[PDB]
Design an enzyme around this catalytic site. Structure first.
Site, PDB file in Angstrom:
ATOM      1  N   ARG A 181       0.813  -1.187   0.000  1.00 53.60           N
ATOM      2  CA  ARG A 181       0.000   0.000   0.000  1.00 53.60           C
ATOM      3  C   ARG A 181       0.856   1.249   0.000  1.00 53.60           C
ATOM      4  NH1 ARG A 181      -5.057   1.777   1.538  1.00 53.60           N
ATOM      5  NH2 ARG A 181      -5.230   3.937   0.791  1.00 53.60           N
ATOM      6  N   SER A 238      -7.546  -1.339   2.355  1.00 55.22           N
ATOM      7  CA  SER A 238      -7.310  -1.762   0.995  1.00 55.22           C
ATOM      8  C   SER A 238      -5.807  -1.879   0.704  1.00 55.22           C
ATOM      9  CB  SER A 238      -7.900  -0.736   0.046  1.00 55.22           C
ATOM     10  OG  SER A 238      -7.660  -1.084  -1.281  1.00 55.22           O
ATOM     11  N   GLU A 245      -6.861  -6.349  -5.764  1.00 51.45           N
ATOM     12  CA  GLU A 245      -7.069  -5.688  -4.478  1.00 51.45           C
ATOM     13  C   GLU A 245      -7.340  -6.739  -3.464  1.00 51.45           C
ATOM     14  OE1 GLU A 245     -10.143  -2.742  -4.592  1.00 51.45           O
ATOM     15  OE2 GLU A 245      -9.664  -2.089  -2.502  1.00 51.45           O
TER      16      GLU A 245
END
EC number: 2.4.2.31
Length: 200
Positions: A81, A111, A148
């Site tokens: 991320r 996420s 994802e």
């Protein structure tokens, strides 16, 4: 398709823009939250009481989380991320995430990508142990073709090390990450890598 999966699809498309601020205890779009609850029939009006509103938001969040949980597990042991942590307003967040050995709880859905990080001031390299709650969205994601792995609220992570820009250690670690190579990719923007671990 379960109604929980359908709620997760909506999260991916648009609900994320309201829910995560709500979960963090941040200012969030209240009118939009209520409009969502009405449109998806958790409430009969867009003008509920505060307890009616809170209870309905709970069910909505739980639907999204349950949809997520019902997706198949995969063998990923690290995800990535990119974050912007160098904003004045995030100064306490920055300090938290750059304290070696700190344990942080992410209150929102989290996420991540199994494949690459989008370049930002901070790149998180997030190790995972078997049985973690993250799930690859696949075709549940609104926009396709960007892997994802989404985690439900309250992921716990340990800050294992921080690698600041401007050393061979940094250069080598960075070179062993897959980064976004989009139109505006520029690794010179990167200030740090934070190596983290999800605690199951």
């Amino acid at each position: 398709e379960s109604k929980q999966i359908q709620a997760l699809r909506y999260y991916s498309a648009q609900g994320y823009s309201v829910i995560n601020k709500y979960l963090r205890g941040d200012d969030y779009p209240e009118t939009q939250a209520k409009e969502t609850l009405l449109s998806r029939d958790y409430l009969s009006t867009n003008e509920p009481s505060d307890e009616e509103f809170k209870n309905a938001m709970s069910v909505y969040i739980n639907d999204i989380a349950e949809g997520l949980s019902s997706l198949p597990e995969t063998d990923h042991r690290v995800v990535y991320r990119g974050l912007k942590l160098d904003k004045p307003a995030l100064s306490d967040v920055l300090k938290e995430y750059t304290t070696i050995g700190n344990i942080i709880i992410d209150k929102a859905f989290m996420s991540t990508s199994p494949d690459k990080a989008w370049i930002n001031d901070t790149i998180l390299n997030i190790y995972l142990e078997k049985g973690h709650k993250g799930r690859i969205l696949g075709d549940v994601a609104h926009f396709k073709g960007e892997a994802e792995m989404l985690f439900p609220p309250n992921t716990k992570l340990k800050i294992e090390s921080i690698v600041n820009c401007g050393s061979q250690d940094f250069a080598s670690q960075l070179s062993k990450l897959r980064l976004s190579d989009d139109a505006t990719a520029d690794t010179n923007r990167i200030k740090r890598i934070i190596n983290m671990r999800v605690l199951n």
